Amino acid sequence: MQAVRLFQGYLWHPRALALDLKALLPGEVAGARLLWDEVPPPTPFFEDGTPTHTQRFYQLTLLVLTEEPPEALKPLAEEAAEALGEVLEGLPPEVGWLLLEDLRPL
Amino acid sequence: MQAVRLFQGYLWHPRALALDLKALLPGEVAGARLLWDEVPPPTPFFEDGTPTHTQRFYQLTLLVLTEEPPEALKPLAEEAAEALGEVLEGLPPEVGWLLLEDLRPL
């Protein structure tokens, strides 16, 4: 019944655009609590050369409560990652994001 | 003063290798508590095409205290990232790692 904050990736949107994430984001995903915390831009510029200081960034994390070992939460993380992906696609077009599934091979 | 959890990246090593991270890693970096938690592979493959399930992954986090807004921690975030990279360079070659600054979108 232990907790483990799994990093899912980042979400962002222009600082000029007002967005109420508490009304837009679900409380949980795949039965795991979904958390979003504001942080500095995780990199200076985007792929197109535009600056990131014009956007507000949020770390997305899933609070999982379990006892089994991490090398067994793979099912949850997968269901969650898919669910999260579909949640983000439902947000206003100006919202951007980078999720684990977007990472290049390590 | 609020405790902000800043995702730093990942660290990993062969699963068959019983390393003692508590003995290998420092307790803090740039005055902030360094946390590491075992999690599922963030991606299925390494750049060379080998599967990630052969390694045990750890999510790296820095617990930063600040009485200023989380979004203004970039100066400290950058100093911590530099210090953390140096720390990781000192670990055995069997340990792999990638910090936020190298994390790119496919």
XYZ file of C-alpha atoms in Angstrom:
212
model
C 0.000 0.000 0.000
C 3.103 2.184 -0.441
C 3.135 5.265 -2.669
C 5.423 5.881 -5.643
C 5.417 9.092 -7.673
C 5.932 8.022 -11.283
C 7.020 10.834 -13.573
C 4.839 10.839 -16.703
C 6.234 13.867 -18.466
C 5.426 17.544 -18.973
C 2.414 19.680 -19.921
C 2.625 23.369 -20.864
C 0.670 26.260 -22.338
C 1.250 29.985 -22.966
C 1.403 32.105 -19.811
C -0.960 34.530 -21.571
C -3.637 31.819 -21.861
C -5.682 31.187 -18.725
C -6.225 27.482 -18.132
C -7.891 25.874 -15.113
C -6.181 22.501 -14.973
C -8.166 21.458 -11.929
C -11.373 21.679 -13.954
C -9.836 20.186 -17.074
C -7.744 17.332 -15.655
C -9.179 14.149 -14.141
C -8.400 13.398 -10.512
C -7.164 9.919 -11.364
C -6.041 7.878 -14.383
C -6.072 4.085 -14.496
C -7.193 4.411 -10.883
C -3.987 6.210 -9.949
C -4.092 9.772 -8.686
C -2.926 12.271 -11.305
C -0.734 15.135 -10.068
C 0.396 18.309 -11.845
C 2.964 20.705 -10.373
C 4.329 23.908 -11.920
C 8.074 24.031 -12.552
C 10.723 25.991 -14.496
C 10.962 25.289 -18.216
C 12.824 21.931 -18.479
C 14.761 23.259 -21.506
C 15.523 26.716 -23.069
C 13.929 26.425 -26.502
C 11.493 24.205 -28.429
C 12.393 22.124 -31.539
C 11.395 25.070 -33.766
C 13.749 27.502 -32.039
C 11.017 29.421 -30.212
C 11.682 30.284 -26.536
C 10.049 28.317 -23.708
C 10.024 31.153 -21.176
C 6.697 32.205 -22.714
C 4.998 29.069 -21.395
C 4.126 27.709 -17.968
C 5.321 24.160 -17.370
C 3.882 21.376 -15.258
C 5.390 18.064 -14.187
C 2.852 15.273 -14.551
C 3.087 12.444 -12.033
C 0.987 9.418 -11.127
C 0.767 8.630 -7.429
C 0.651 4.840 -7.289
C -0.162 2.980 -4.080
C 1.039 -0.592 -4.073
C 3.308 -3.177 -2.468
C 4.279 -5.326 -5.443
C 7.673 -4.432 -7.012
C 8.099 -1.696 -9.679
C 8.951 -4.413 -12.210
C 5.282 -5.372 -12.117
C 3.689 -1.913 -12.318
C 4.452 -2.061 -16.014
C 0.802 -2.980 -16.688
C -0.520 0.050 -14.803
C 2.022 2.439 -16.307
C 0.954 1.251 -19.737
C -2.786 1.615 -19.156
C -2.101 4.952 -17.474
C 0.179 6.290 -20.208
C -2.469 5.475 -22.835
C -5.237 6.985 -20.693
C -3.171 10.078 -19.978
C -2.387 10.492 -23.662
C -6.098 10.495 -24.458
C -6.775 12.964 -21.623
C -4.234 15.476 -23.000
C -5.626 15.245 -26.541
C -8.883 16.484 -25.033
C -7.327 19.760 -23.847
C -7.387 23.149 -25.700
C -5.057 23.057 -28.788
C -2.621 25.566 -27.337
C -1.640 23.008 -24.689
C 1.501 21.069 -25.495
C 3.170 18.091 -23.855
C 5.919 15.488 -23.780
C 5.094 12.090 -22.305
C 7.237 9.029 -21.721
C 6.004 7.465 -24.976
C 7.550 10.456 -26.779
C 11.055 9.862 -25.426
C 13.669 8.723 -27.925
C 15.415 5.426 -27.158
C 17.824 6.048 -24.251
C 8.953 27.430 2.350
C 7.527 24.813 0.005
C 9.266 21.587 -0.998
C 9.334 21.338 -4.777
C 10.112 17.962 -6.336
C 12.144 18.478 -9.535
C 12.499 15.447 -11.835
C 16.186 15.076 -12.776
C 16.172 12.125 -15.137
C 16.962 8.416 -14.875
C 19.749 6.100 -13.789
C 19.903 2.366 -14.515
C 22.131 -0.679 -14.223
C 21.960 -4.382 -15.154
C 19.281 -6.175 -13.116
C 21.700 -9.001 -12.328
C 24.025 -6.452 -10.693
C 23.205 -5.897 -7.015
C 24.512 -2.334 -6.570
C 24.031 -0.321 -3.370
C 22.889 3.107 -4.574
C 22.692 4.402 -0.987
C 26.438 3.764 -0.830
C 27.135 5.027 -4.368
C 25.098 8.238 -4.510
C 25.291 11.346 -2.290
C 22.424 12.287 0.031
C 22.215 15.774 -1.406
C 23.197 17.914 -4.368
C 23.396 21.698 -4.252
C 21.864 21.654 -0.780
C 18.795 19.689 -1.890
C 17.833 16.136 -0.924
C 18.519 13.693 -3.739
C 15.866 11.001 -4.074
C 15.874 7.871 -6.243
C 13.046 5.415 -6.734
C 12.832 2.202 -8.716
C 10.318 2.443 -11.587
C 9.436 0.648 -14.837
C 11.556 1.435 -17.909
C 10.442 4.843 -19.255
C 10.926 3.513 -22.775
C 11.226 0.026 -24.346
C 14.583 0.411 -26.068
C 18.009 1.951 -25.767
C 19.491 3.887 -28.673
C 21.379 0.770 -29.773
C 18.121 -1.165 -30.091
C 18.505 -3.439 -27.059
C 15.511 -3.950 -24.745
C 15.343 -1.922 -21.532
C 13.877 -4.763 -19.448
C 17.442 -6.066 -18.883
C 18.075 -3.123 -16.540
C 16.663 -1.822 -13.263
C 15.656 1.842 -13.632
C 15.667 4.588 -11.026
C 13.908 7.918 -11.278
C 16.065 10.757 -9.935
C 14.439 13.597 -8.009
C 15.727 16.641 -6.127
C 13.631 17.953 -3.238
C 14.158 21.701 -3.320
C 13.019 24.060 -0.578
C 12.166 27.627 -1.625
C 10.050 30.498 -0.416
C 9.855 31.813 -3.956
C 7.597 30.469 -6.748
C 8.487 26.992 -8.107
C 8.631 28.420 -11.636
C 11.535 30.687 -10.607
C 13.896 27.863 -9.568
C 15.718 27.676 -12.900
C 19.025 29.130 -11.607
C 19.183 26.493 -8.855
C 17.873 23.829 -11.232
C 20.763 24.495 -13.605
C 23.411 24.439 -10.866
C 21.944 21.191 -9.465
C 21.916 19.594 -12.918
C 25.590 20.421 -13.409
C 26.535 19.076 -9.983
C 24.424 15.935 -10.496
C 26.072 15.168 -13.848
C 29.492 15.350 -12.211
C 28.251 13.042 -9.469
C 27.022 10.473 -11.986
C 30.274 10.654 -13.977
C 31.915 9.280 -10.849
C 29.783 6.124 -10.738
C 30.873 2.743 -12.138
C 30.714 2.317 -15.929
C 28.026 -0.358 -15.476
C 25.644 2.433 -14.477
C 23.788 4.216 -17.247
C 22.035 7.544 -16.953
C 20.363 10.389 -18.815
C 19.402 13.721 -17.277
C 16.640 16.121 -18.231
C 18.997 18.175 -20.400
C 19.589 15.307 -22.804
C 15.941 14.155 -22.942
C 14.769 14.802 -26.532
C 11.400 14.251 -28.367
C 11.288 11.689 -31.201
